[PDB]
Amino acid sequence: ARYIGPKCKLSRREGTDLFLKSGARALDSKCKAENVPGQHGQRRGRLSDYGLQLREKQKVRRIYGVLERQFRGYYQEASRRKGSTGENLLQLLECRLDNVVYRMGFGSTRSESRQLVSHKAITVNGQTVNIPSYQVKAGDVVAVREKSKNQLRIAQALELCGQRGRVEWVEVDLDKKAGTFKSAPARSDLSADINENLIVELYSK
Amino acid sequence: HGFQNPTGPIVREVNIGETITVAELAAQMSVKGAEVVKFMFKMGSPVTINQVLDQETAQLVAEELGHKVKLVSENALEEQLAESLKFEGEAVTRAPVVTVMGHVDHGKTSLLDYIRRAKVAAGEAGGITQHIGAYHVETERGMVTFLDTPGHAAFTAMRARGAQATDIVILVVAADDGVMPQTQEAVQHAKAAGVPIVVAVNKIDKPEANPDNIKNGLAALDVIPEEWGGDAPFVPVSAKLGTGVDELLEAVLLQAEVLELKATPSAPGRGVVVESRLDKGRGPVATVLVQDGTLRQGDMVLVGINYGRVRAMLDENGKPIKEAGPSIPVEILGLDGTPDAGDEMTVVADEKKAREVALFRQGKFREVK
Amino acid sequence: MVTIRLARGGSKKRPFYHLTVTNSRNARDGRFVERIGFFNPVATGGEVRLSVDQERATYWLGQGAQPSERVAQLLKDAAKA
RNA sequence: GAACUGAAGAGUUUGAUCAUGGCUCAGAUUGAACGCUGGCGGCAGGCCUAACACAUGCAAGUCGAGCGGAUGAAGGGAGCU
RNA sequence: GGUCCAGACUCCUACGGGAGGCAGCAGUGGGGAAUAUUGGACAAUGGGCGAAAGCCUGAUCCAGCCAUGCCGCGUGUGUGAAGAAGGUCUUCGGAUUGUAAAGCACUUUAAGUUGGGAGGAAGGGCAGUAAGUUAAUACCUUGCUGUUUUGACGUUACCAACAGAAUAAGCACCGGCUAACUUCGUGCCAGCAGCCGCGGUAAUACGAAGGGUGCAAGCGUUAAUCGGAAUUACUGGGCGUA
Ligand SMILES: Nc1nc2c(ncn2[C@@H]2O[C@H](COP(=O)(O)OP(=O)(O)CP(=O)(O)O)[C@@H](O)[C@H]2O)c(=O)[nH]1
Ligand SMILES: [Mg+2]
Ligand SMILES: [Mg+2]
Ligand SMILES: [Mg+2]
Ligand SMILES: [Mg+2]
Ligand SMILES: [Mg+2]
Ligand SMILES: [Mg+2]
Ligand SMILES: [Mg+2]
Ligand SMILES: [Mg+2]
Ligand SMILES: [Mg+2]
Ligand SMILES: [Mg+2]
Ligand SMILES: [Mg+2]
Ligand SMILES: [Mg+2]
Ligand SMILES: [Mg+2]
Ligand SMILES: [Mg+2]
Ligand SMILES: [Mg+2]
Ligand SMILES: [Mg+2]
Ligand SMILES: [Mg+2]
Ligand SMILES: [Mg+2]
Ligand SMILES: [Mg+2]
Ligand SMILES: [Mg+2]
Ligand SMILES: [Mg+2]
Ligand SMILES: [Mg+2]
Ligand SMILES: [Mg+2]
Ligand SMILES: [Mg+2]
Ligand SMILES: [Mg+2]
Ligand SMILES: [Mg+2]
Ligand SMILES: [Mg+2]
Ligand SMILES: [Mg+2]
Ligand SMILES: [Mg+2]
Ligand SMILES: [Mg+2]
Ligand SMILES: [Mg+2]
Ligand SMILES: [Mg+2]
Ligand SMILES: [Mg+2]
Ligand SMILES: [Mg+2]
Ligand SMILES: [Mg+2]
Ligand SMILES: [Mg+2]
Ligand SMILES: [Mg+2]
Ligand SMILES: [Mg+2]
Ligand SMILES: [Mg+2]
Ligand SMILES: [Mg+2]
Ligand SMILES: [Mg+2]
Ligand SMILES: [Mg+2]
Ligand SMILES: [Mg+2]
Ligand SMILES: [Mg+2]
Ligand SMILES: [Mg+2]
Ligand SMILES: [Mg+2]
Ligand SMILES: [Mg+2]
Ligand SMILES: [Mg+2]
Ligand SMILES: [Mg+2]
Ligand SMILES: [Mg+2]
Ligand SMILES: [Mg+2]
Ligand SMILES: [Mg+2]
Ligand SMILES: [Mg+2]
Incomplete structure (x- = not known):
């Protein structure tokens, strides 16, 4: 399945940016993002350790739009690997095909990139892949189907990716709308406020 | 893409079932309940804050306010199956179905036995018939x-x-005994069913005879002989001696002016359950009389609330077959339960739909029970 | 007798075969004395179509093992390559 | 060059406290069943109870190049036509 | 799925006389909370016989049914403040549902229709050719060549075109343990409950409504095993008064 519905409620509940709109105008002037959603928005209501762990895990899940069972799978495979499962989890989550397409800049949001992937418009190594979970390997050359390169959405999102901060680990050729995924980003490159140790503590229980 | 302020009124979609309340109707209309209450009071019948109303007034108020509406079918599955059930052409005459009615011991089983040359009356516990039987016979006329x-x-x-499934009734009455209560019951059943009646006075070989009081008795019951006004034909028979049976059969088949085109045999078969039972070795077995269409072996059939596909299909005396004509009685195997008499069987030719419709029917049947 | 035949693994519509030496009166997927290779009908990519251990095959042939028709064809196919 | 690397507590006896001690909860699993609800596909699984009684179909045959024998086409045709 | 003897239980009978063994595959009655089709083919892999064609094969390969499990994908995407109408609450100012809706613009995955389209196939028949076989260009065995012939699944996997947002969200919980709160009814009643326990006139615990929190084609309850339990303590407990 997939979460469909209001997307500014999640930002208000988590209390942070949690990029879910196109980012065109702003985030503050659409949802007054300083109250928790619902009737009792003004109450502060500090929360326990379990609440903090749950909020962190839910925040990560709500940013990539992954449900609970697939998150369990990702966590299990990350723990099975070597080298600090906490950062292996983000290493794994950054290699998803929809996330890669979003980073390359062919989609306004994660959901838009997911629909680009699902609707048979993205080819990974020169053949169509429509699974928004395909782990992109380093060196793969993602592209767009020639019959769909003149869609207004990709061109519109190209400049938005132009001004959002350089990722500096993928490359893109704009004329042919074709890019290369050099390598999965290091833990430093990602936002150093997602404290994954809370996730590890929550699941190891 | 900019934001434009709407100018005219707002219109919604209104979903109305068999019944609806004014509060929830207004809720779907995005209007207050007090305003619609006063609107109803101003035009026609006053309504309460929580009064249940029908489909017609709900659709009226939906159409007058301008919002689009659609009615909700409480039995959408049933009507969907019925509309998708069948449609064919052609028409061929079918063998007539005739039921035999009368008073006790007036000699109807003997009459049928002489017609078929079968003598089932020798059996039968106690000397009385207790089961409804159906036989397909090749008479000398048809x-x-x-x-x-x-x-x-x-x-x-x-x-x-x-x-309910005869279209012709043979009313047997004994010459010596005359009109008896079950004769009145039989004529009432025939009149209710809207069915032609052929009367047969039996036991004419007795010295008492007197086959003329029956004529007056049936005339008083609104059944007129061939003479006089003329509604039904009379004929004297002897059942055991077999005199007059030929003329009775010819009179019965003379009522073939009812045409009776059974539609194409190529249509999916329909029928009615006549006799259902349970067998320790083959499960629930249903004796059904086809009405039109054709029933074939290995066909998905929905009967009553039991569904299932026919594993096997026997005729009256065993000997498994693979076909069943427009008006042939057959014993089918393969249902998941014993149906009750009077239920209808239809070939669905689509297993899924039969399954959910049958489970649907079973569920409300338990609820109604 | 002792025969060399194919034991079917894999999955639905995707067969995989093991070259197996068995007593003849066993289930197709039951007891065996030795497996001496495999055969892949689909193969494709980096997979190999079939592989055979020459020494074991020759030893079992010299002991009187009777290959099946398909195995008889595959053995000389492998030898040719 | 790898074949492993891993261990949480809480509620409840008292006016309150520490200890002892039982009960209960948070996890992972089913050949599961039941209630409500139900779009698709891939791969698996499906009488755990009565080793209870079984209607009807099929599940073990092959060899005429071991042997008598009877059914013996196509034809060579002949004769009367 | 053979013989004989005896036994229990069914059945046929012309009344003298015989037959039977689904814990093989489908199937029935019964018992139960509960577990499926009287399906297709020997095309593939095996097995029996044959010399060879070939015959048999409920093994097997495949289909049917069932959210029973595991995995994957859909039920749209962007913009959109008069912060619409309605519902809910209120200190009557307003807040919330909420960019959520409507409007505007995009796309067609899956399902729907139509056209293309592999792989599972090794072999068999016929004719010629070359070697070996003897005593022999014969028959026969083997190589190769040429021709012909094989698929239940199957309307295969897959690929392409067409119209449109149209065809597709529910379940549990919200006093603490434990993430999530207020109103309205009821008054030791009706009820809830895993443990503490709530309910006797302002109930965040009962029943509804608004809001929220978890999961999601599933969600809960019941049954059962291990863990937590160092609570049978080898690792790793104790015995003055528990
Ligand atoms: N004299 C005479 N007797 C007859 C005639 N037909 C039948 N019977 C006798 O009447 C008796 C009853 O007849 P039957 O046919 O059994 O009557 P029924 O209508 O079947 C009785 P039920 O209503 O239970 O079925 C029988 O013994 C039969 O011998 C007839 O034509 N003449
Ligand atoms: Mg899932
Ligand atoms: Mg009778
Ligand atoms: Mg009597
Ligand atoms: Mg009498
Ligand atoms: Mg069944
Ligand atoms: Mg075995
Ligand atoms: Mg075994
Ligand atoms: Mg304790
Ligand atoms: Mg206390
Ligand atoms: Mg239950
Ligand atoms: Mg149910
Ligand atoms: Mg239900
Ligand atoms: Mg058993
Ligand atoms: Mg049983
Ligand atoms: Mg057979
Ligand atoms: Mg021989
Ligand atoms: Mg047996
Ligand atoms: Mg014996
Ligand atoms: Mg005996
Ligand atoms: Mg005996
Ligand atoms: Mg048995
Ligand atoms: Mg069985
Ligand atoms: Mg058993
Ligand atoms: Mg049963
Ligand atoms: Mg039962
Ligand atoms: Mg069940
Ligand atoms: Mg079974
Ligand atoms: Mg075979
Ligand atoms: Mg032969
Ligand atoms: Mg068969
Ligand atoms: Mg499934
Ligand atoms: Mg269920
Ligand atoms: Mg199951
Ligand atoms: Mg308002
Ligand atoms: Mg499609
Ligand atoms: Mg082929
Ligand atoms: Mg096609
Ligand atoms: Mg809390
Ligand atoms: Mg409750
Ligand atoms: Mg109150
Ligand atoms: Mg509670
Ligand atoms: Mg409550
Ligand atoms: Mg429940
Ligand atoms: Mg339980
Ligand atoms: Mg237990
Ligand atoms: Mg338990
Ligand atoms: Mg222990
Ligand atoms: Mg326990
Ligand atoms: Mg411990
Ligand atoms: Mg010790
Ligand atoms: Mg102790
Ligand atoms: Mg001591
Ligand atoms: Mg003491």
């Missing part, structure tokens, strides 16, 4: 389907359904 029914007053319901 093909007929006879239905023998018990004459006792305790099987009245069994007689009623017997008149």
Whole structure:
């Protein structure tokens, strides 16, 4: 399945940016993002350790739009690997095909990139892949189907990716709308406020 | 893409079932309940804050306010199956179905036995018929389907359904005994079913005879002989001696002016359950009389609330077959339960739809029980 | 007798075969004394179509093992390559 | 060059406290069943109870190049036509 | 799925006389909370016989049914403040549902229709050719060549075109343990409950409504095993008064 519905409620509940709109105008002037959603928005209501762990895990899940069972799978495979499962989890989550397409800049949001992937418009190594979970390997050359390169959405999102901060680990050729995924980003490159140790503590229980 | 302020009124979609309340109707209309209450009071019948109203007024108020509406079918599955059930062409005459009715011991089983040369009357516990039987016979004039029914007053319901699928009734009355209560019951059943009646005075070989008081008795019951006004034909028979049976059969088949085109045999078959039972070795077995279409072996059939596909299909005397004509009685195997008499069977030719419709019916059947 | 035949693994519509030496009166997927290779009908990519251990095959042939028709064809196919 | 690397507590006896001690909860699993609800596909699984009684179909045959024998086409045709 | 003897239980009978063994595959009745089709083919892999064609094969390969499990994908995407109408609450100012809706613009995955389209196939028949076989260009065995012939699944996997947002969200919980709160009814009643326990006139615990929190084609309850339990303590407990 997939979460469909209001997307500014999640930002208000988590209390942070949690990029879910196109980012065109702003985030503050659409949802007054300083109250928790619902009737009792003004109450502060500090929360326990379990609440903090749950909020962190839910925040990560709500940013990539992954449900609970697939998150369990990702966590299990990350723990099975070597080298600090906490950062292996983000290493794994950054290699998803929809996330890669979003980073390359062919989609306004994660959901838009997911629909680009699902609707048979993205080819990974020169053949169509429509699974928004395909782990992109380093060196793969993602592209767009020639019959769909003149869609207004990709061109519109190209400049938005132009001004959002350089990722500096993928490359893109704009004329042919074709890019290369050099390598999965290091833990430093990602936002150093997602404290994954809370996730590890929550699941190891 | 900019934001434009709407100018005209707002219109919604209104979903109305069999019944609806004013509060919830207004809720779907995005309007207050007090305003619609006063609107109803101003035009026609006043309404309460929580008064249940029908489909017609709900659709009226939906259409006057301008919002689009659509009615909700409480039995959408049933009507969807019915509309998608069948449609064919062509028409071919079918063998007539005739039921036999009368008073006790007036000699109807003997009449059928002489017609078929079968003598089932020798069997039968106690000397009385207690089961409704259907036989397909090749008479010297043609093909007929006879239905023998018990004459006792305790099987009245069994007689009623017997008149539901006959279109012709042979009323046997004994010459010596005359009009008896079950004769009145049989004529009432025939009149209710809207069915032609052929009367046969039996036991004419007795020295008492007197086959003329029956004429007056049936005339007083609104059944007129061939003479006089003329509604039904009379004929004297002797059942055991077999005199007059030929003329009775010819008179019965003379009522072939009812055309009786059974539609194409190529249509999916329909029928009615006549006799359902349970067998320790083959499960629930249903004796059904085809009405039109054709029933084939290995066909998905929905009967009553039991569904299932026919593993096997026997005729009256065993000998498994693979076909069933427009008016042939057959015993089918393969249902998941024992149906009750009077239910209808239809070939669905689509297993899924049959399954959810049958489970649907079973569920409300448990709820109603 | 002792025969060399194919034991079917894999999955639905995707067969995989093991070259197996068995007593003849066993289930197709039951007891065996030795497996001496495999055969892949689909193969494709980096997979190999079939592989055979020459020494074991020759030893079992010299002991009187009777290959099946398909195995008889595959053995000389492998030898040719 | 790898074949492993891993261990949480809480509620409840008292006016309150520490200890002892039982009960209960948070996890992972089913050949599961039941209630409500139900779009698709891939791969698996499906009488755990009565080793209870079984209607009807099929599940073990092959060899005429071991042997008598009877059914013996196509034809060579002949004769009367 | 053979013989004989005896036994229990069914059945046929012309009344003298015989037959039977689904814990093989489908199937029935019964018992139960509960577990499926009287399906297709020997095309593939095996097995029996044959010399060879070939015959048999409920093994097997495949289909049917069932959210029973595991995995994957859909039920749209962007913009959109008069912060619409309605519902809910209120200190009557307003807040919330909420960019959520409507409007505007995009796309067609899956399902729907139509056209293309592999792989599972090794072999068999016929004719010629070359070697070996003897005593022999014969028959026969083997190589190769040429021709012909094989698929239940199957309307295969897959690929392409067409119209449109149209065809597709529910379940549990919200006093603490434990993430999530207020109103309205009821008054030791009706009820809830895993443990503490709530309910006797302002109930965040009962029943509804608004809001929220978890999961999601599933969600809960019941049954059962291990863990937590160092609570049978080898690792790793104790015995003055528990
Ligand atoms: N004299 C005479 N007797 C007859 C005639 N037909 C039948 N019977 C006798 O009447 C008796 C009853 O007849 P039957 O046919 O059994 O009557 P029924 O209508 O079947 C009785 P039920 O209503 O239970 O079915 C029988 O013994 C039969 O011998 C007839 O034509 N003449
Ligand atoms: Mg899932
Ligand atoms: Mg009778
Ligand atoms: Mg009597
Ligand atoms: Mg009398
Ligand atoms: Mg069934
Ligand atoms: Mg075995
Ligand atoms: Mg075994
Ligand atoms: Mg304790
Ligand atoms: Mg206390
Ligand atoms: Mg239950
Ligand atoms: Mg249910
Ligand atoms: Mg239900
Ligand atoms: Mg058993
Ligand atoms: Mg049993
Ligand atoms: Mg056979
Ligand atoms: Mg021989
Ligand atoms: Mg047996
Ligand atoms: Mg014996
Ligand atoms: Mg004996
Ligand atoms: Mg015996
Ligand atoms: Mg048995
Ligand atoms: Mg069985
Ligand atoms: Mg058993
Ligand atoms: Mg049963
Ligand atoms: Mg039962
Ligand atoms: Mg079940
Ligand atoms: Mg079974
Ligand atoms: Mg075979
Ligand atoms: Mg032969
Ligand atoms: Mg078969
Ligand atoms: Mg499934
Ligand atoms: Mg269920
Ligand atoms: Mg199951
Ligand atoms: Mg308002
Ligand atoms: Mg498609
Ligand atoms: Mg092929
Ligand atoms: Mg096609
Ligand atoms: Mg809390
Ligand atoms: Mg409750
Ligand atoms: Mg109150
Ligand atoms: Mg509670
Ligand atoms: Mg409550
Ligand atoms: Mg429940
Ligand atoms: Mg339980
Ligand atoms: Mg237990
Ligand atoms: Mg338990
Ligand atoms: Mg222990
Ligand atoms: Mg325990
Ligand atoms: Mg411990
Ligand atoms: Mg010790
Ligand atoms: Mg101790
Ligand atoms: Mg001591
Ligand atoms: Mg003491």
